[PDB]
């Protein structure tokens, strides 16, 4: 169900809460900006079950999470080869802004 993955945690912490998410075969996920902007999430160009790009960046979304309290509940299809995908926050590298969804059942 649209579970919320916030981009940062308490007063400072700039991580993915949660980070490793096993959802359903075609569930809904929520992306909320918590700290230091802006956050765009691109998917597994390199790390996905059927090593493709085409679809990977057709799942990942770029909505420049920049305003303090920006939550975008989004949904996936029911095929998404039921594996551990990987979404990273474009301008925030080093500072662990990366997450994984398992579209399994
Ligand atoms: Cu970020």
UniProtKB/Swiss-Prot annotation:
InterPro entries: BlueCu_1 (IPR000923), BlueCu_1_BS (IPR028871), Copper_blue_Plastocyanin (IPR001235), Cupredoxin (IPR008972), Plastocyanin (IPR002387), Plastocyanin_cyanobac (IPR023511)
Alphabetized PROSITE patterns for the sequence: COPPER_BLUE
UniProt entry keywords in alphabetical sequence: Copper, Electron transport, Membrane, Metal-binding, Thylakoid, Transport
GO cellular component, one term: plasma membrane-derived thylakoid membrane
Cofactor: Cu(2+)
Record: residues binding Cu(2+): 39, 89, 92, 97
Membrane topology summary: Peripheral membrane protein
Molecular function as annotated in GO: copper ion binding; electron transfer activity
CDD domains the record matches: Plastocyanin
Superkingdom: Bacteria
Occurrences of domain Plastocyanin-like (ranges): 1-105
Keyword field contains Protein biosynthesis: no
Localization: Cellular thylakoid membrane
Family of this protein: Belongs to the plastocyanin family.
Cited function: Participates in electron transfer between P700 and the cytochrome b6-f complex in photosystem I.
Protein name: Plastocyanin
Highest classification ranks of the organism: Bacteria, Bacillati, Cyanobacteriota, Cyanophyceae, Nostocales
Gene this protein is translated from: petE
